[PDB]
Amino acid sequence: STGSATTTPIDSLDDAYITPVQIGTPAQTLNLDFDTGSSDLWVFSSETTASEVDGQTIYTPSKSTTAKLLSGATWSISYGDGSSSSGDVYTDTVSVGGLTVTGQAVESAKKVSSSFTEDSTIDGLLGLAFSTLNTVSPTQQKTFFDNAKASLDSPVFTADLGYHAPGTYNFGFIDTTAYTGSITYTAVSTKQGFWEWTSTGYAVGSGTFKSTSIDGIADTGTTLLYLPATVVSAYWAQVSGAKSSSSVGGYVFPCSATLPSFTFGVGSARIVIPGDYIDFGPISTGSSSCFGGIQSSAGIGINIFGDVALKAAFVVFNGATTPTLGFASK
């Protein structure tokens, strides 16, 4: 089997991407944030504290003839940006782009933090990291990809995120028309539950390539590119007037600037992030100070190849017995 679904930026800055997901019988369609940095499929629901729902589409398990309460199971998760959610668990039928999993754990939110409430466009998350990170207790549950894997034509999914435009998540096949040149594959460590890999270095604009190992995660659920402070300083030094602002919470730059590109290494191959991808617009409405898309990972504890990086590539998440990651230009 295979599946194919379009993923759509939630706003004009590509702050996140939503993908429609069919849950239950009859289908209840929710727009979920596909997140290769976590491993829980959780949704806004009829159980969510009413004051914490503000415009989201909810899952109502009592209206699904295939929903079954997973007795005694609870979940609770906290993300790197400080947001959180928690609740109980149903199993139900879940389909993405034509690909169907029966008995998928659908984690029903009883509580969500303010950032989730305030984002009316995201109805929940669909985790695509390794199932070892799944938070359901006392019986850990598998991701949608993990459940679908054996049935897929090939045990892979691909992320093809757009810049200020829709893109595609495919399951079970590699669309050879979706990228240019060849796909370069690189080793993955699953030791922390992530799609963790080592970039071979970077370049700023038309500058020379710096060969240096950068360990980080491929994370579709993180907006920006978080890299070591040395790397980030070298980038923003090429932008007149750019500075790190503790009050804003990262590097800002004059909105009048033309940003240089940023290149990262995948083995001997090179992925180029156009400068425009690194612009996240005014820090507040009407400001001439703009927020940067490349930020320091210092104090995160891990480097993150978030959407800023991934949307510059066609990315293969290979879930073979020994997982790997593939990157192609497009």
Swiss-Prot record:
Name the enzyme's class: hydrolase
Reactions catalysed according to its record: Hydrolysis of proteins with specificity similar to that of pepsin A, prefers hydrophobic residues at P1 and P1', but does not cleave 14-Ala-|-Leu-15 in the B chain of insulin or Z-Glu-Tyr. Clots milk
Instruction: Outline the extent of the Peptidase A1 domain.
Output: 17-328
**EC annotation from Swiss-Prot or TrEMBL:** 3.4.23.22
Residues at the active site: D35, S199
This protein's UniProt keywords:
Aspartyl protease, Disulfide bond, Hydrolase, Protease, Signal, Zymogen
Name which cysteines form disulfide bonds.
C255-C290
One of this protein's GO BP terms? Answer: proteolysis
Q: Which GO terms describe its molecular function?
A: aspartic-type endopeptidase activity
Superkingdom of the source?
Eukaryota
Which family does this protein fall into?
Belongs to the peptidase A1 family.
For this entry, the protein name equals Endothiapepsin
Q: Which organism is it from?
A: Cryphonectria parasitica (Chestnut blight fungus)
Which gene is the coding source of this polypeptide chain? EAPA
Q: Which residues of the full protein are shown?
A: 90 to 419 of 419
